[PDB]
Amino acid sequence: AVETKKQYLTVFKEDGIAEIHLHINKSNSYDLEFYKEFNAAIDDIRFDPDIKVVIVMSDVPKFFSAGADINFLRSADPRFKTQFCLFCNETLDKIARSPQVYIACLEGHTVGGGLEMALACDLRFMGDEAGKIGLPEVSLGVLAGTGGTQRLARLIGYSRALDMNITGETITPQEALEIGLVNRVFPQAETRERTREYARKLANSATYAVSNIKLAIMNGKEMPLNVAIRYEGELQNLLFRSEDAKEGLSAFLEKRQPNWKGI
Amino acid sequence: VETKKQYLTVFKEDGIAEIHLHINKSNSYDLEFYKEFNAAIDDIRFDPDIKVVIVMSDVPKFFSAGADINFLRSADPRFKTQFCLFCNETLDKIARSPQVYIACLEGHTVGGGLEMALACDLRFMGDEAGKIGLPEVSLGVLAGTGGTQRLARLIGYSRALDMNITGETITPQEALEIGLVNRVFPQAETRERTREYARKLANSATYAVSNIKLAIMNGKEMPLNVAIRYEGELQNLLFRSEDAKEGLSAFLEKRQPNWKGI
Amino acid sequence: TAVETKKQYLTVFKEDGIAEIHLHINKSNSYDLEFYKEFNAAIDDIRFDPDIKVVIVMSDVPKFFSAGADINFLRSADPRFKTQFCLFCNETLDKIARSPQVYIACLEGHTVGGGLEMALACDLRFMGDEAGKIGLPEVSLGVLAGTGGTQRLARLIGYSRALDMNITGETITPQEALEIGLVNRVFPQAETRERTREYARKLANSATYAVSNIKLAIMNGKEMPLNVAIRYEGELQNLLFRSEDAKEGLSAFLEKRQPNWKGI
Amino acid sequence: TAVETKKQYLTVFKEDGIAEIHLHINKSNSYDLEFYKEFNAAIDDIRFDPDIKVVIVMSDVPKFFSAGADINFLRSADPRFKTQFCLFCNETLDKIARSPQVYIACLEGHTVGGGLEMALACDLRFMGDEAGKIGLPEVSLGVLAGTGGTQRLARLIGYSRALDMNITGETITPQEALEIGLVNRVFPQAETRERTREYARKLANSATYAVSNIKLAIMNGKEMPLNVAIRYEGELQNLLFRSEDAKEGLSAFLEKRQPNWKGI
Amino acid sequence: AVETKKQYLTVFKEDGIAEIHLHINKSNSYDLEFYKEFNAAIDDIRFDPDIKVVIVMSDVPKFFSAGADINFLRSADPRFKTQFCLFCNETLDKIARSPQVYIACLEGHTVGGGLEMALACDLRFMGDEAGKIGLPEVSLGVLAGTGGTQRLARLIGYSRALDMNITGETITPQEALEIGLVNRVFPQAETRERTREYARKLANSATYAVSNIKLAIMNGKEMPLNVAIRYEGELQNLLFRSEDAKEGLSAFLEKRQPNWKGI
Amino acid sequence: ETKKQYLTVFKEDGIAEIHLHINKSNSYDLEFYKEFNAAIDDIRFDPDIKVVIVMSDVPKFFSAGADINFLRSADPRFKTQFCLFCNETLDKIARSPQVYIACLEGHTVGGGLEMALACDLRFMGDEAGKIGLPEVSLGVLAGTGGTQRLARLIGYSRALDMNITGETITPQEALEIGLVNRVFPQAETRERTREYARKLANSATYAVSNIKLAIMNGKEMPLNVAIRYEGELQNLLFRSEDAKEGLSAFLEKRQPNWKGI
């Protein structure tokens, strides 16, 4: 229901969940045109009141994404590369400010720009046989410049991130799970359904609160504790005035099922 | 030594103060409880003899289930705002107090209950204590007493986000593995093993322990280059302390240090 | 071919893009002000040496990497001298995160107090499986880990976990250190130096300009808010896009051949 | 005609959305721990009163707003007590910036030391043109402005100017205070109270929910990196967009008529 | 290339200077469509290596901008408003990350969202007869929600900004200059010219240094000093490797006129 | 008096004076900074020094910045390290116990202003000349803290305007934008600067010192914890000899006998 296809990407919308399917090429190596579409999708989904969760997945076998297209980067003026990197970063930055919870469904290789895109998502689920995950940019004389060095350091620790970034080595889904690089490892041929089940459980709950919780944590982490709780407190104020908060406190007190409306 | 309030009791002995929570069957609090809790924190702050504070529940299956849902029902939204602000500022005080605060978790520690525990410096839980987490989302609201923020900083933002949006609670063992608690003791030995730890602290160079607690809890909020400056001033206070003179000597003379906490 | 320069507290060896700072102060490598003055000089020297891309800090003392500050020297000093002694040591350790070279602490023995603090200031920490004890026992003396210990430990392994270790002063094993993220690798004791050098060799033999800018991006970027941290990362990347290794690296990849890194 | 509630060292008056906290400790309004407990209590009471939109802090003592801490009280306390005393006073002042009411310090007399620190903690400062002296002379006593004075002054008028004023301990005039941004207004001595009240009444009679969220946005948002500070500003705005006053305010503007504010 | 147009705005590119002329409404009150065009103008200029300076000005008499359209805002639902505000904010946030120096030429009223846009620019020049400047949002029951409260506080001081925001009172160009709300105050008639003169001088200098100086200050101000200087250092490293640094450096020794090339 | 190649250090009555006598326009190189750094370390370990004044022995210049000849010669990688060292040296001032005062009697531009900026206070003469950052006219920026310290001192927009045009300003204008703390009649700039320093050295110097540290380092911290830092510095003061002597003298209304401890 309501699926708008594009050149390198397709968006499916249904039951409060939007699915952004990637299909750029055989390794999903992106260029500036792909990000233009990806950015347009986030904007579109942001303005869509119905969507509570966005799952980002790949339609390309064995690959979620391998990163930027090296061939596209060859005939690139340095100043162009700069603006190209800047636009990709700003696009990824938008996810943390969006009301929907973004989930990266990793079924294939997620390296370089590929992992950077997943790191920008709120959560990451991976198949027990998805392959490699990491940032090998160093093997090309460059670094993970799409927030990879900064987001990985914050996600798994600055020392562990430094190790991975300088050696450019990739790891397994199981290893990514233990260091917190991903939130869940599901059996391979069961990754999509288990991801969708999680997203479905979110879409059918107090979605206004799940969204505010998402904003509280993602943007509050950049703030000094004493004022971060002020930000958290304003998001709560909005919830205290919502319909679901009333319906929720009631249903609980009446031992009945809550009728979530998302507002 | 003993000071009983309506929802809480404070026991002081051998440099250790224990705050016992006895609000109700699930220890679900209201504004009145927090006023008493705040008063206890202030009283203990002005008592130079207390070096460690252990917060524990006298209620069987609960440390604290959080805010009394009924008490907040139909309460004015502006009131809730002020109620939350007061509860937050009260919890914020722990990180600025000289005593090391330890949360002794023997029962369920959820919602406001966990938020209170998160504001403590350390957390020790029993292997059969139950569940621990933030289920607020199931009510259409969030962990607004510092839960979203302190959990994110303690166990990681992504892991905290996952727990907060699903509202699912985990076990003590799981909590230990992700760093949500510092120790998991045999249920029946939880209280004694916590007191044991507290006693070792209270019998050591307590001025150092105190300044160490301050350096870390408040220093973590500063850029590293100036945080070490803060750590430095706390060190300057220790270098001029009596225990520091005694500690350096007792060490060179291969003997047992006689700490005074000064 | 291989140059070696020595002093009384430490010796610096330089070879094929790697510098090794060997510590030989005393039975437990307990340091004083003069030691740090030499360590600081080594850092400055290495910084101004374009050929060095990696630095390994190791100890030539049997059972110790370093037990921290010399209590004999530490005491007997005026509180104002201690303040300045500590400030200088901290500023010295602070210089590592700002240096182009990747600093690796090769831990083969006890690494406690100031010893661990020095190790915490390095970019990576590798320890032997029989290296001994690692922790911050300063509290047992009535003082605290004042050379960055309380702050760096908290940021590395978590504030509550660091609080616990600092207030009790208890030390842990190499294995336990590995599980909480205190060290990055635990190698078989007799292979510690070997495997550490092997790791450094691989770095020195790769796109060292990228390696260097990556280290700067993370160590200094972690102190900035995310939205601007990526800007700092972007400028470091700009420098890399303008380097020769980048050109070389991209060509070798498309032309499917081993790239020949020049470090610039 | 305001509702009046008197304490031992202060009196709180309430009327038409405005609360006034009158200080009457002693001849120089030098405070002790008891005063601050009453001040803290007043802040809490007002916070829980949804009718109060603005709070004006003023003195009933002729030539002094407040000269700071009672030096007698301060001299006889254990250093550990002083620490807790200062900590309590600071936390009390910190609460102003988190409160929904706009706090205005009405300075008609000398405002020095802890007196200025209390004023610095308020959102705005209005001073009469013959109020006297203002500054932090703590250094002349061998101590510093420990109630947030060094920090808030630096942030308000600039760190170098604040440093100069703190290290010398010299006070300045209301006109000099105004030019460096230490106070927001200088009114004729004779009508300093009425004009402060007039400013307060305009606020209290406007879209108070917007005034409050604006005060919160700026005072707490200034502690956040810009990219997320605007997110905080955004949630406060979201609360207004859902307010009754926003609907009315926008309508009144379109209908070119006077808004009927409800504060909700 | 040329001086391309759009609906509510037109961009003129010439000799390293791009002028964004606003012509939205008789008061230049904007809506979402306008910001979309403004965002597009920003992106286009970014990817144009020849543009060094960007001048934003109004073609509408007596108004630089009066802010958002109250009709567009009044009737919109809360959730839409949120996304609308978020988009405008992210658009303005981009100016500080752009290589070009942004100058706001204020010849008419600059209030509410109008001032907020000017605040997001690097510099502000205003005519001595330009009229009023301030944030009157509070008189509508809302606040300066597009970076207004935050940038004003950082620019002129939190307490002064607070005073201005809660009273909604606007001030004169002269008073604005006194508090640093604007950088220059030119004679009304000589405003567009003096602004272009200043922009001309910039475009004819070591333009790479100017760009990096702007990036160093606008983004570095968000960092703790000790690392802010590291950021300044990397931007400097780029300058040390540029052709202009080598030029201006030697030219300086040779008591000669530097021939800048922007690289 | 302790003399060095590029500078000289004079110590007396609790005040240390670092006189710059590098060259014609006091345009520095790496060696100069190695000496400045050494001076800072020496002064730090001298419990007698309470104030430090940086002044020039050169008539029309405080300092014109980095020596362009010495610079051009350098390789890009050397420049990085050269700058890094200079920056770290200037950073040490904000962490030192002494209050640093830059005495500006001549031109203070580029690296010259960057050095002055790292000092705690700046006093300048009404006929001292120009002050600013003209690095842009060379194709580079004020890479030794200039862009960052200026922005924080006079405001980011005003600093941006000055940095991109490289325009220098007069002493009077500097005072107006807060670039300097004082402007004295040329002839009495050193005299009046030394009076200020003298009044500092003769007061409760431990307090003056902790105040300088509280402000300079606390400004890099969030307010809620910055006040904690301020609090610990105050705890040290409450335990000093002077605090007791200061509190007494006031209640006994007698001039206090400071000891600096």
Torsion of CA D159, D160, D162, D164, to 10 degrees: 160
Torsion of CA F80, A152, C136, C85, to 10 degrees: 20
Which residues of F belong to the active site? 114, 135
Give me the amino acid identity at D242: R
Spatial strand order in the sheet of D64-66: D64-66, D110-112, D134-135
Nearest-by-Cβ selection for D84 from B46, B81, B86: B46
Residues of E in contact with D213 (CB under 8 A): 143
- Taking the C-alpha atoms of residue C84 and residue C94, their distance in angstroms, rounded to an integer, is 15
CATH of B203-262, one of 3.90.1150.10, 3.30.450.270, 3.40.50.620, 1.10.12.10: 1.10.12.10
Q: Top-level CATH class of D205-264?
A: mainly alpha
- Contact of E150 with D217, CB cutoff 8 Å: yes
Instruction: List, as one string, the DSSP characters of C116-185.
Output: HHHHHTSSEEEEETT---EE--GGGGT---TTTHHHHHHHHH-HHHHHHHHHH---B-HHHHHHHTSSSE
Question: Which of C190, C188, C67 is CA-nearest to residue C134?
Answer: C67
Give me the amino acid identity at E196: R
Q: Top-level CATH class of E204-263?
A: mainly alpha
- Contact of D232 with D220, CB cutoff 8 Å: yes
Q: Does domain E1-203 have CATH number 3.90.226.10?
A: yes
Neighbours of chain A (3+ CB pairs under 8 A): B, C, D, E, F
Strand residue runs (E) in chain B = 2-4, 8-13, 16-21, 28-29, 52-57, 62-64, 66-67, 100-105, 108-110, 122-126, 132-133, 183-185
CB neighbour list of residue E178: distance below 8 Å, 6 or more residues apart: none
| Resolution (Å units) | 2.2
- Contact of D143 with F237, CB cutoff 8 Å: yes
State the nearest Cα–Cα gap between D72 and chain F, in angstroms. 8
Spatial strand order in the sheet of A17-22: A4-5, A9-14, A17-22, A53-58, A101-106, A123-127, A184-186
For the beta carbon of residue C27, count every other beta carbon within 10 angstroms.
10
Task: Give the number of C-alpha atoms closer than 13 A to the C-alpha of residue E164, restricted to the C-beta side.
Answer: 28
Helix A207-220 to helix A225-240 angle, to the nearest 10 degrees? 170
For the beta carbon of residue B14, count every other beta carbon within 10 angstroms.
14
Task: Tokens for D85, please give them.
Answer: 């005393």
Burial of B134 (0-12, 13-18, 19+ CB in 10 A): buried
Contact D80 B45 (CB under 8 A): no
Neighbours of chain E (3+ CB pairs under 8 A): A, B, C, D, F
Contact F236 B240 (CB under 8 A): yes
Task: Tokens for F234, please give them.
Answer: 């105050």
- DSSP 3-state of E6: coil
Could you tell me the CA-to-CA distances from F87 to E2, E160, F148, F208 in Å, in that order? Answer: 45, 34, 11, 25
Burial of F12 (0-12, 13-18, 19+ CB in 10 A): exposed
State the nearest Cα–Cα gap between D234 and chain F, in angstroms. 21
Could you tell me the CA-to-CA distances from E20 to D243, E4, E58, E185 in Å, in that order? Answer: 36, 10, 8, 20
Beta-bridged to residue F122, according to DSSP, are F102
Task: Tokens for D143, please give them.
Answer: 């101590």
CB neighbour list of residue C43: distance below 8 Å, 6 or more residues apart: C92, C95, C96, C99
Contact E238 C239 (CB under 8 A): yes
- Taking the C-alpha atoms of residue D71 and residue D89, their distance in angstroms, rounded to an integer, is 15
Total length of chain E: 263
Task: Tokens for A170, please give them.
Answer: 């990739």
Task: Tokens for B209, please give them.
Answer: 């322990």
Question: Which of E245, E234, E233 is CA-nearest to residue E208?
Answer: E245
Contact F235 B237 (CB under 8 A): yes
Return phi, psi of residue B110, to 5°.
Answer: -130, 155
Q: What string of H, E and C letters represents the secondary structure of D128-153? A: ECCCCCEECCHHHHCCCCCCCHHHHH
- Contact of F146 with F133, CB cutoff 8 Å: yes
Task: Tokens for C38, please give them.
Answer: 């030499």
Question: Which of E105, E161, E109, E169 is CA-nearest to residue E137?
Answer: E169
Task: Tokens for D191, please give them.
Answer: 């009508």
Beta-bridged to residue B21, according to DSSP, are B8, B57
> Chain D window 51-80: which residues touch B at a Cβ cutoff of 8 Å?
78, 80
Could you tell me the CA-to-CA distances from C116 to C68, C69, C147 in Å, in that order? Answer: 7, 11, 10
- Contact of C139 with C93, CB cutoff 8 Å: no
Instruction: List, as one string, the DSSP characters of E144-184.
Output: -TTTHHHHHHHHH-HHHHHHHHHH---B-HHHHHHHTSSSE
- Contact of A165 with A135, CB cutoff 8 Å: yes
- Taking the C-alpha atoms of residue A137 and residue A141, their distance in angstroms, rounded to an integer, is 7
Task: Tokens for C29, please give them.
Answer: 């490598």
Could you tell me the CA-to-CA distances from A55 to A19, B107, B259, C198, D158 in Å, in that order? Answer: 5, 37, 59, 41, 48
Parallel, antiparallel, or unpaired for β F65-66 and B108-110?
A: unpaired
- Contact of C139 with C179, CB cutoff 8 Å: no
Contact B230 F235 (CB under 8 A): no
Find tokens 């750029």 and name the residue: A24
CATH number for region C1-204: 3.90.226.10
Q: Does domain B1-202 have CATH number 3.40.50.150?
A: no
- Taking the C-alpha atoms of residue E60 and residue E57, their distance in angstroms, rounded to an integer, is 9
Give me the amino acid identity at C221: G
Burial of F202 (0-12, 13-18, 19+ CB in 10 A): middle
Task: Tokens for E189, please give them.
Answer: 């008639």
Parallel, antiparallel, or unpaired for β E9-14 and E17-22?
A: antiparallel
Spatial strand order in the sheet of B108-110: B62-64, B108-110, B132-133
- Taking the C-alpha atoms of residue C159 and residue C180, their distance in angstroms, rounded to an integer, is 12
Query: What is the DSSP-derived secondary structure letter of residue F240?
Result: S
CATH number for region F1-201: 3.90.226.10
> Chain F window 89-108: which residues touch D at a Cβ cutoff of 8 Å?
99
- Taking the C-alpha atoms of residue A212 and residue E82, their distance in angstroms, rounded to an integer, is 13
Plot region of F178 (φ>0 → left; ψ -120 to 50 → alpha; else → beta): left
CB neighbour list of residue E109: distance below 8 Å, 6 or more residues apart: E27, E62, E63, E64, E65, E66, E130, E131, E132, E133
Residue of A nearest to E91 (CA): A90
CB neighbour list of residue F247: distance below 8 Å, 6 or more residues apart: D71, D74, D75, D141, D142, D143
Chain-centre distance of CA A106, in angstroms? Answer: 10
- Contact of E6 with E34, CB cutoff 8 Å: no
Q: Is B226 on the interface with E (CB under 8 A)?
A: yes
Q: Is F159 on the interface with E (CB under 8 A)?
A: yes
State the nearest Cα–Cα gap between C110 and chain F, in angstroms. 32
Residues of C in contact with E231 (CB under 8 A): 224, 228, 231-232, 235
Query: What is the DSSP-derived secondary structure letter of residue C263?
Result: -
Torsion of CA C188, C190, C194, C196, to 10 degrees: 50
Burial of B139 (0-12, 13-18, 19+ CB in 10 A): buried
- Contact of C116 with B222, CB cutoff 8 Å: no
- Contact of D257 with E77, CB cutoff 8 Å: no
Could you tell me the CA-to-CA distances from A60 to A64, A67, A71, D134 in Å, in that order? Answer: 7, 13, 19, 71
- Taking the C-alpha atoms of residue D214 and residue A111, their distance in angstroms, rounded to an integer, is 44
Q: Does domain F202-261 have CATH number 1.10.357.10?
A: no
Question: Which of A147, F247, E210, F157 is CA-nearest to residue D75?
Answer: F247
Query: What is the DSSP-derived secondary structure letter of residue C66?
Result: E
- Taking the C-alpha atoms of residue C209 and residue C224, their distance in angstroms, rounded to an integer, is 22
Torsion of CA D93, D96, D97, D103, to 10 degrees: -120
Q: Which long-range contacts (CB under 8 A, 24 or more apart) does B82-87 make?
A: B82/D47, B82/D48, B83/B31, B84/A233, B84/A236, B84/B144, B84/B145, B85/A233, B85/D47, B85/D98, B86/B31, B86/B34, B86/B35, B86/B38, B86/D44, B86/D47, B87/B31, B87/B34, B87/B112, B87/B145
Find tokens 């202030």 and name the residue: B42
Task: Tokens for C232, please give them.
Answer: 């700092």
- Taking the C-alpha atoms of residue D22 and residue D108, their distance in angstroms, rounded to an integer, is 12
Contact D231 A241 (CB under 8 A): no
Return phi, psi of residue E120, to 5°.
Answer: -75, -15
D46: enclosing H helix or E strand: helix D33-47
Domain boundaries, chain A: 1-203, 204-263
- DSSP 3-state of B223: coil
Torsion of CA D84, D90, D94, D95, to 10 degrees: 60
